[PDB]
């Protein structure tokens, strides 16, 4: 217990989690050599010394997740901008359609009044009064 | 800070101190070592907060890149909107009747969606154009001359 | 001190967003000064439809009559 | 630091909106849509105005927008 | 990414490492096989989101044609 605890604590206090992960060979060599030296005094051969289970704190796990999600977000946004470009194309197309419709109606309405608007208002009043005629949560209060 | 960062030096110092102290007591100290170290929850909270502050100061580095991508997308969408505005504001230059017709169609669509909704709508009975003596009856037609 | 560093990065990421918004405004203003603000009316109607749909499921939203 | 960022942003944005502030109206529409999206799932008790539904087609204010477009 | 796309390389490298390591222990390593590999749900969520991004870039390609047809209807 004492030798293992002291060796591990001394090895790990040298560095931090990032340095521990980055250079596994360094820490493995340090622990192996230190344990062999310590057991030399106590005369116990260490057939194999191997550290094989690393687990960090939640803070460093969150940091690693942020680091990875940075590059993942870059990769995904590289396509999100393409999607936005396609949406811009499909919005210019709809704008062209609406503009042509407006051109037709404006050309036909500048010269010939706007009675069609009134007729469509009456037709839409009828249609809306029918559409809302089944909902039980619609109420018609008097004007003012 | 010094104790943890230089735990080995404090450990050997206390080893020497303990062996010399217990030497008079006829007790050989085969090996002296530190097994555990803990602080009040406030000091550990402070160090954890330092680590989280460093982590957030790093995270800002990804926030800036996200902002860059969002800026690019915003510029793309704004290009689309500007082109649409120039190609559609010329049509409504002459007479914007299409806007009134679109408004009527949007009213019909909103009615369609509301009919199956879950809100509590309180329309105005004037929508039913049932009051035929209100003196607003001829307003629409009167506006046509 | 690290919070100050974070605020520096946030200032950078806010200048970037401001540049994006300024470019968008530049495009739309260059278009609208010459054209006219009919696109705004069309978007008003489209947004009215979209909002009326979005709030069409919440049971805690009520539509009282104007005035 | 934050005020430096805000002032630098204001310079460019005001220069942009100098000519015609249509972008503000379009942004307002988009913000209305986003607010609707967030409200739809909220726990508040909202009381909008039926005028939001542009259903009253006969009201004198119906042709207001188009009138402003001439 | 490299570990998966080059899974064969890491697999054979670990096979050679295991063979050499266990040679001293008089154990013949007939074959070393990677029978499974998994990650945290966050990394898999990220890769799923990458697929989402690609399929969204395709759905936009379809939406543009839908917009063309809608324009014709409007006209």
Residue numbers in the entry:
A (entry chain H): 120 to 263
B (entry chain g): 151 to 295
C (entry chain G): 197 to 263
D (entry chain f): 226 to 295
E (entry chain h): 151 to 225
Paper text:
SPFH proteins assemble into homo- or hetero-oligomeric rings that form domed structures.
3D classifications of our cryo-EM dataset revealed two main conformations of the PHB1/2 complex: a ‘closed’ conformation determined to an overall resolution of 2.4 Å, and an ‘open’ conformation, determined to an overall resolution of 3.1 Å, that showed increased gaps between the SPFH domains of PHB1/2 heterodimers. The diameter of the wide end of the closed PHB1/2 complex is ~190 Å, and that of the open PHB1/2 complex is ~196 Å. The major structural changes between the closed and open PHB1/2 complex conformations occur at the SPFH domains and the adjacent CC1 region (up to PHB1 V200 and PHB2 V214 in the CC1 helix; rmsd = 9.783 Å), while the C-terminal portion of the PHB1/2 complex remains largely unchanged (rmsd = 0.708 Å). Most of these SPFH domain interactions are lost in the open PHB1/2 complex. Like in the Erlin1/2 complex, hydrophobic and aromatic residues in the SPFH1 domain of both PHB1 and PHB2 contribute to membrane anchoring together with the N-terminal transmembrane helix.
